[PDB]
């Protein structure tokens, strides 16, 4: 997220929502804006967690 472009502060917060298992659709819903774009990388990040750990997702 951070390395991609997503703010570091908001990243940690967003990651918490990912643990819910909800789809990217639920993510943008909370953003409340034209955030349509990161969804292309958010999907890949999900697998990253199980591949390593939520912590790693942050740097992403």
Swiss-Prot record:
Q: How does activity depend on temperature?
A: Displays a high degree of stability when incubated at temperatures between -80 and 75 degrees Celsius for 60 minutes. Autoclaving the peptide at 121 degrees Celsius for 15 minutes had no effect but incubation at 100 degrees Celsius for 60 minutes caused a 32-fold reduction in activity.
Q: Could you tell me the superkingdom of the organism this chain comes from? A: Bacteria
Give the chief site where it resides: secreted
List the GO terms this entry assigns under cellular component, sorted alphabetically.
Answer: extracellular region
- What's the record's pH-dependence note? Stable from pH 2 to 12.
Output the Gene3D superfamilies linked to this UniProt entry.
Answer: Bacteriocin AS-48
Chain residue numbers at which the record places covalent cross-link Cyclopeptide (Leu-Leu): 1-60
Tell me the compartments it is located in: Secreted
Q: Where are the transmembrane segments?
A: none
* One Pfam assignment: Bacteriocin_IId
| Keyword vocabulary terms for this entry | Antibiotic, Antimicrobial, Bacteriocin, Secreted
Tell me which InterPro entries the record gives: Bacteriocin_AS48, Circ_bacteriocin
Q: Which residues form a coiled coil?
A: none
The UniProt entry's GO biological process terms, in alphabetical order, are:
defense response to Gram-positive bacterium; killing of cells of another organism
Keyword Secreted, does the record have it? yes
Query: Transmembrane: present as a keyword of the record?
Result: no
Q: What does this protein do?
A: Cyclopeptide antibiotic that inhibits the growth of Gram-positive bacteria, but has no effect on the growth of Gram-negative bacteria.
Question: What name appears for this protein in its UniProt entry?
Answer: Carnocyclin-A
The species this protein belongs to is Carnobacterium maltaromaticum
Ranked from the top, the taxonomy reads: Bacteria, Bacillati, Bacillota, Bacilli, Lactobacillales
């Amino acid at each position: 997220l951070v390395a991609y472009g997503i703010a570091q502060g908001t990243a940690e917060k967003v990651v918490s929502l990912i643990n819910a298992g909800l789809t990217v659709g639920s993510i943008i819903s909370i953003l409340g804006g034209v955030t349509v774009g990161l969804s292309g990388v958010f999907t890949a990040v999900k697998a990253a967690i199980a591949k390593q750990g939520i912590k790693k997702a942050i740097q992403l």
